[PDB]
């Protein structure tokens, strides 16, 4: 089962946004093997922000 299509337009836009925010200065622990829990974390913080 798959939840996140990483190449779909709004998800790949979010992907490009955090890749650019990485490549501008720096962030924490690295990438290229993602997790769906991090996607749920991002979407839950977006839920709290919209609320």
């Amino acid at each position: 089962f798959q939840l996140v299509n990483y190449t779909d337009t709004i998800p790949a836009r979010i992907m490009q946004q955090w890749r650019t925010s990485d490549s501008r200065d720096h962030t924490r622990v690295d990438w290229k093997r993602p997790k769906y829990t991090s996607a749920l974390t991002y979407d839950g913080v977006k839920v709290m922000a919209e609320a």
Partner: single-chain antibody
Amino acid sequence: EVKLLESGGGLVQPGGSLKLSCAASGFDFSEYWMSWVRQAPGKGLEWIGEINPDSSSIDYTPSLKDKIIISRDNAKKTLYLQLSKVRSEDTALYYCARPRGNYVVMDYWGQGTSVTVNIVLTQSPASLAVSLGQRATISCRASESVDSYGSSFVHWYQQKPGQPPKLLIFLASKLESGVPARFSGSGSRTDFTLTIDPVEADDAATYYCQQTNEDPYTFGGGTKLEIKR
């Protein structure tokens, strides 16, 4: 593995145009960002610019915008740098590199090509001679606080004469892939320290510690390593 090869360098007349290509192999250039950085002969490095995979935002320095153009090709996985109206300051070594600000583990710099027409990071010492099989120590002092969110975003690289600076140590506590277990890093918030154990003969180069925590992204002064015999 990750491999980058630059081509098109050499000599160029003053006032003309120049196009340098950089081919990649072993990774996906259509997702990973690219960067280009110049280095004068005998001086420190200087970041020319960076470009994303989708070719939507290409950033550069504010003082070299009218003479640099960065493009890329994800189908051929090759980056292209175009320079117009070259001057006497254009005689330098350019270097194409993978995303170094983005991913510290996937940080890798290509060989580059030679073209012939406040945070203060102090290295310690300027020059030292260590024998083979020993352990050398190189210190670095920062004028401002480079610590952010618990991690010290400082990279330690080694550049030789004719060889590009390979990213040896990332984030002051992790060793890069491909390099053997012969270099470690430590320090705290004003003083960083790179240790080499054991000392080999091929490690005789110039070590540089560079921090990119905030603007401006400075580079180290350069500390040469001499192998005793």
